[PDB]
Amino acid sequence: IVGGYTCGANTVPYQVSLNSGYHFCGGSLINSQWVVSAAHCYKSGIQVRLGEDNINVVEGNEQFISASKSIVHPSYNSNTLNNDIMLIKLKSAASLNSRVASISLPTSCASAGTQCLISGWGNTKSSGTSYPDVLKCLKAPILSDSSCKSAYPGQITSNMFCAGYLEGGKDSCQGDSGGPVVCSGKLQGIVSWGSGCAQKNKPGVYTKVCNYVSWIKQTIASN
Ligand SMILES: [Ca+2]
């Protein structure tokens, strides 16, 4: 997250870190057994880390639970990032508590102009590299479909939305991928892509989770 703030320990209790020997992507806990992330974060060998603040220090509220199954969307296209969504099943259910909690799936799609909370342990520099240890947060508004398409001509599908600031300076970034975009208390986006981070006229692009609720529900009813 570039241009964000330190969230505060466990104030984003649905945020997870995906670990394969190192943090590599975020995700969102949607119930005690399942995490939503980006399909482009698929790796074999994923351990889900819940209750994290500093990902490099064991502070006492973590739950580390291996994935048993990962399910990339059936129509994921890794070239365009259309349908950039994945479900990860935990080997055992998380113990839900004040620091480890699920986020609701949406009933309706969020509205342009809505300010959402985006979070992660990704890069905090637009130019260069610095990865934080503690969770960072950013409030960013959903941009209109027309603005998003103007920013990325011929690349935005109905399963994507843009959020952020066209002047630059505030965005998600590498290492935030797969993490949450929460708007009115529901998981509306997944950190997916963008050209660089926090560059002028290149806002973040996010998987539009409201388009996937029936897939998510039938998949978790069946696995
Ligand atoms: Ca930790």
What domains, with CATH codes, occur in the chain? 1-12+103-210 (no CATH), 13-102+211-222 (2.40.10.10)
Query: Two tokens at 142?
Result: 């959903």
Query: Two tokens at 78?
Result: 């890794």
Whether 208 contacts 159, CB under 8 Å:
yes
- According to DSSP H, which parts of the chain are helical? 145-151, 213-220
- Three-state DSSP class for 205? strand
CA distance 81 to 147: 19
Backbone phi, then psi, for 215, in 5-degree steps? Answer: -60, -45
Q: Which residues are annotated as a binding site?
A: 52, 54, 57, 62, 171-172, 174-175, 177
Query: Two tokens at 103?
Result: 């986020």
Whether 8 contacts 15, CB under 8 Å:
no
- E strand map for the chain: 5-6, 15-19, 23-31, 34-37, 47-50, 63-72, 86-90, 115-120, 136-141, 160-163, 180-183, 186-193, 204-208
Cα 62 to the center of its chain, rounded Å: 19
CA distance 219 to 25: 22
* Angle 202-75-177 from CA coordinates, rounded to 5°: 40
Q: Which residues are annotated as a binding site for Ca(2+)?
A: 52, 54, 57, 62
* CA–centroid distance, residue 157 to ligand 1 (Å): 36
Torsion sign over Cα 23, 98, 96, 104: negative
Looking only at the bridges linking them, the beta strands covering 186-193 and 180-183 are: antiparallel
Residues 6+ apart with CB under 8 A from 128: none
- What's the start-to-end Cα distance of the chain, in Å? 33
Experimental method reported for this structure: X-ray
The environment of the single-atom ion ligand 1, i.e. residues with CB closer than 5 A, is: 52, 54, 59
Resolution in A: 1.1
Whether 14 contacts 101, CB under 8 Å:
yes
Radius of gyration of the chain (CA): 16
- Report, as residue numbers or ranges, the catalytic residues: 40, 84, 177
Per-residue exposure over 109-121, b if at least 16 CB sit within 10 Å of its own CB, e if not: ebeeeeebbbbbb
Give 97-139 as a DSSP string: BTTB---BPPSSPPPTT-EEEEEES----SSS----SS-EEEE
Q: Which residues are annotated as a binding site for substrate?
A: 171-172, 174-175, 177
CA distance 81 to 100: 29
Residue 98 burial (C-beta neighbours within 10 Å; 0-12, 13-18, 19+): exposed
* CA–centroid distance, residue 116 to ligand 1 (Å): 25
